[PDB]
Each structure stands twice: as C-alpha cells, then as structure tokens.
C-alpha cells in the first residue's frame, strides 16, 4: 500500500499531535494538574472526569474506573517533573467507564506534552509501580460504584 495516498498519511505527524494537544485544553480536570510531586486521582462518572478528594486517595470502587497521575522528580534533574499515568479498571466497571478512562489517559498524556508513561491497571493485576503509590495498607477496594453513563438499548 501507499501510506501517502491513504487515510493514514497524516498519522504520526506534528499536525496530529497539535490537534490533540488543543483538544486536551478543553478538559477542566487537567488545569493545574502535574504541578508538584505527588498523586492526583480522578474517577470517571457518566463520561465526566471527576476529582477524587485526597482523603480518599488509595480507596477505589470495584465498580468504577480511575485515572491516577503520579508526578515525581526524575533521576536526571531533581528540580523537574516527570509522570507516570495509571488508569485503574475495577473488576466490575462498565465498558463506558473503562473506555473513557483509557481515552482520557491519552488526553492527559497529550496535555502534559507526551511526557507521561501510561500503565493499564486492572483490579487484581496492578503493577509493582501502582502498588508502590500507596502507604502500607493504603490500597483498599470498595464495594459498588457509580452508575454507567450508557443508556441500555433493550
């Protein structure tokens, strides 16, 4: 095939990155994100990105999906910031929640200039990096969750 004659000729370009960077400017949840070392968490709630209060960080509803931004100083420079972005998928989260969490993880990555490294964290399969984010006994799974944003077609 001739990529250049095709509908994927503009994938992988500066233009693609520019358009997606602009789109990420229209999400209120990212404003002020990633400005200091620490952990910031949002939950998908009927397609919206909703902050989780710091007092609840580490407690996750099994029925829900989340975005967890870990901001840290890299080895290369103690005064700069680097990022791991984890999206956490509860065992009982619905398809709309997991898909929104995945898409909005990419968007937050875009917002932060591509710098975050992405991690998909399914309940019970969490990475060593994810387990390391929370103090001893800090990671707790809660029963239930918020309702799906999908309308069910009968």
């Amino acid at each position: 095939y001739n990529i250049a004659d095709s509908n994927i000729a503009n994938l992988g370009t500066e233009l693609e990155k520019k358009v997606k960077l602009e789109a990420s400017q229209h999400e209120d949840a990212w404003k002020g994100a990633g400005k200091q070392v620490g952990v910031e968490i949002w939950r998908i709630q009927q397609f919206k990105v909703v902050p989780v209060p710091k007092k609840h960080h580490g407690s996750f509803y099994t029925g829900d999906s989340y975005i967890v931004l870990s901001t840290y100083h890299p080895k290369t420079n103690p005064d700069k910031l680097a990022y791991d972005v984890h999206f956490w998928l509860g065992a009982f989260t619905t398809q709309d929640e997991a898909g929104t969490a995945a898409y909005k993880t990419v968007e937050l990555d875009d917002y932060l200039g591509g710098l975050p490294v992405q991690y998909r964290e399914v309940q019970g399969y969490e990475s060593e990096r994810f387990l390391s984010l929370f103090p001893k006994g800090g990671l707790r799974i809660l029963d239930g969750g918020v309702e799906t944003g999908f309308h069910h077609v009968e």
């Binding site: 095939y1 990529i3 004659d5 095709s6 509908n7 994927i8 000729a9 503009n10 994938l11 992988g12 233009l15 693609e16 358009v19 997606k20 602009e22 789109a23 990420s24 229209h26 999400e27 397609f47 999906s65 999206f87 998928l89 398809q95 709309d96 997991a98 898909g99 929104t100 969490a101 995945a102 898409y103 909005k104 993880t105 990419v106 968007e107 990555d109 992405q118 998909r120 799906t148 944003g149 999908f150 309308h151 069910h152 077609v153």
Partner: protein, 363 residues
C-alpha cells in the same frame, strides 16, 4: 444535542446514538433493484424482497464504489431507520485503515453538502475497538465483510508504518463457501443465494485447531456434519466446508491469493514495531468484527502466533463477546466526550476549507 454514530461496514450498517450501549439500527448495506429488467429497495426490505431483486453492496473491501447507492444507504439510515433529521445531529463515521484518501473526502462532502450535518468526524475503526476494550496499547485485528486489518497502537497512537491490510474478509469467505458447496452438488449462484450461503457460514462454520487433522476426521465419519434448512424447505448437509471456508483466513491461497494469512500478518505487524513494545502487543491482541466470530478462531490464532513468536513470548488473544459491535461502541464512548467532539469538523469549517479539511482534523 445527541451525536449519531454510524459504522458503515462493507456488509452491515451499524447506526445509533452516542451514549447508547449498542447500535439501534443494524441492517444490510445493500441496495436491491428488480432482477428482471419501485425503482429500488434498501437494507432489510431489500433482503425481504430478495426473491425478485438483484442485490448490490455499495461498499467493497471497505471502500465506497457506488456513491449514488451509498447516498441511498445513508438516507435510509437517517430517515427510515433512525428517523432523525441529520441537520440536527453531529455525526461520527468510521473507516478501515489504508483506504484511499478520496474515500473520506467524499464522505465529508456528502455529509455536509447533501445531508447538511452540523459537524462530523471520520474515525479509524480499529482505534475505536481498542478503546472499547479499555486499552491504550494493543494490536487490533479487525475483520468485517470487506477488510481484515491489523493496527498496532501504543499509548493511544496508531503506528502507521506497522499497519497491515488484507482485502480478504467475510464476503470473500461467503463467495468461497458458495464455490465449494458446488462439490456436493449444490448450486448457489445469484446475489440472493449469496445471502443464504452467508447465513449458512455464520451459523455453521468454525476454525479447526489443526486443519489437516480435521480433514481426516471429516473423512473418517459423519461426526462433523451439520444440516441446514433452505428457505424453500430443502435440507442440505455440509461437512468439511464448515472449516475449509474460514481456513482461507489462514491460507489465502484457498482463493488464489498469495498473501500471508491473518496469523502471519499479525506477527509481521508486531515485528514492524519497536522491539521494546512488542511484548505489550503480543499480550494484547484484540479481535474485532464479524469475521472474527468463528468458533475456534482465538485458539487457532493463539497456536499460530505461538509458533511464529519467540519461544518464551507471552501471547494473549482478547475476544470480546460483543466484538461484532466493538467499533460502534468505541465510537459511542468517544462521541460522548466533549473534548473528542471539539476536534470534529463544523459545517462552517467545511464551507471555508472543503473536503481537504478532513485530513487536518481526523486522526
């Protein structure tokens, strides 16, 4: 304001509203005209009257080849199925990767100039399926009625140099089943008869785990045979055609194509990606589309990719039960997000820039 999501497959229209968990309209992407040469029928009703019609598909191998008939399909989707006024609804369309650029240019032109939609976007099908699976990294094998293609995606970006495409999919498999059923003395020839054989294929075919062993099993006794009742009431029997037909996906030389089979194209696509992400792709093969619904296909894919890959490679085939609708569902999710809608083409932008703007907005 509710966006429309329309996944125009080569064989089926899947259409509905963003935020629904399934498409509300699913019907054949066909226009029927009198077989004897009121003017035409579309979709389900063409199928219903197929006894007196010749059926034509405006999409072939994922590409619109009859634009007048595709206009009839879209008109039917909006006004007769969904019963909406398109000028009231932002519309998300879809496309297989590696289509010629003019396909989405003309999609854009018709949506704005004929249907007066307020906004639209053309999405890459395989990317929608990946998000429907809740992933940002993986390699999607999407196979519908028209195209089989492999799209590796890393951290939300498709890797265009590694995308693979085979213009061999469900319709070719139906045609091949029609052909090999002649060996039993059955004669399926007409466009209407193609639809009967398509149904036989969907109901009775499967992918053998070991093709040569299965051919031997089929010759040793009738244990694999199945019966099928034709619309006229005649009952036919089919045997090794059940698995010879989808074997073509693994052996395209069954229909005279020199191409790599779907296991080899998947492997080749992964091998075109940077080595450090290949383990993630091998552990996240996501199947998408109706031609991935054969019983046994995931197990066969697992076996064949294991034979090609490094001996310690962890390999996983993800086969969502809803994967006939994964593309549509991914579109329903993304079209429910205001930031994704921010990227859509507005009618004013189309008025000022024309069809070329689709390449600067839709990724």
């Amino acid at each position: 304001t509710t966006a429309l999501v329309c996944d125009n497959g080569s064989g089926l229209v899947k259409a509905g509203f963003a935020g629904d968990d399934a498409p509300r309209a699913v019907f054949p992407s066909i226009v029927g005209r009198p077989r004897h040469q009121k003017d035409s029928y579309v979709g389900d009703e063409a199928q219903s009257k197929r006894g007196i019609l010749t059926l034509k598909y405006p999409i072939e191998h994922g590409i619109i080849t009859n634009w007048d008939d595709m206009e009839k399909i879209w008109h039917h989707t909006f006004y007769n199925e969904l019963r909406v006024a398109p000028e009231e609804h932002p519309t998300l369309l879809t496309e297989a990767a590696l289509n010629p650029k003019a396909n989405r240019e003309k999609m854009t032109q018709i949506m704005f100039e004929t249907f007066n939609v307020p906004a639209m976007y053309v999405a890459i099908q395989a990317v929608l399926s990946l998000y429907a699976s809740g992933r940002t990294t993986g390699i999607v094998l999407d196979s519908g009625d028209g195209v089989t293609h492999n799209v590796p995606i890393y951290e939300g970006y498709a890797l265009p140099h590694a995308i693979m495409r085979l213009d061999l999919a469900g319709r070719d498999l139906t045609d091949y089943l029609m052909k090999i059923l002649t060996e039993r003395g059955y004669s399926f020839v007409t466009t209407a008869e193609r639809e009967i054989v398509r149904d036989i294929k969907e109901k009775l075919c499967y992918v053998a785990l070991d093709f040569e062993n299965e051919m031997a099993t089929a010759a040793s006794s009738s244990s694999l045979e199945k019966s099928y009742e034709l619309p006229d009431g005649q009952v036919i029997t089919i045997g090794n055609e059940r698995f010879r037909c989808p074997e073509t996906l693994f052996q395209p030389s069954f229909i005279g194509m020199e191409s790599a089979g779907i296991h080899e194209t998947t492997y080749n696509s992964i091998m075109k990606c940077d080595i450090d992400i290949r383990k993630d792709l091998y552990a996240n093969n996501v199947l998408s589309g109706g031609t991935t619904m054969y019983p046994g296909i995931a197990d066969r894919m697992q076996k064949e990719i294991t034979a090609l890959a490094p001996s310690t490679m962890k390999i996983k085939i993800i086969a969502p039960p809803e994967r006939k609708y994964s593309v549509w569902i991914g579109g329903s999710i993304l079209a429910s997000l205001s930031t994704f809608q921010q990227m859509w083409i507005s009618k004013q932008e189309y008025d000022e820039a024309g069809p070329s703007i689709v390449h600067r907005k839709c990724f």
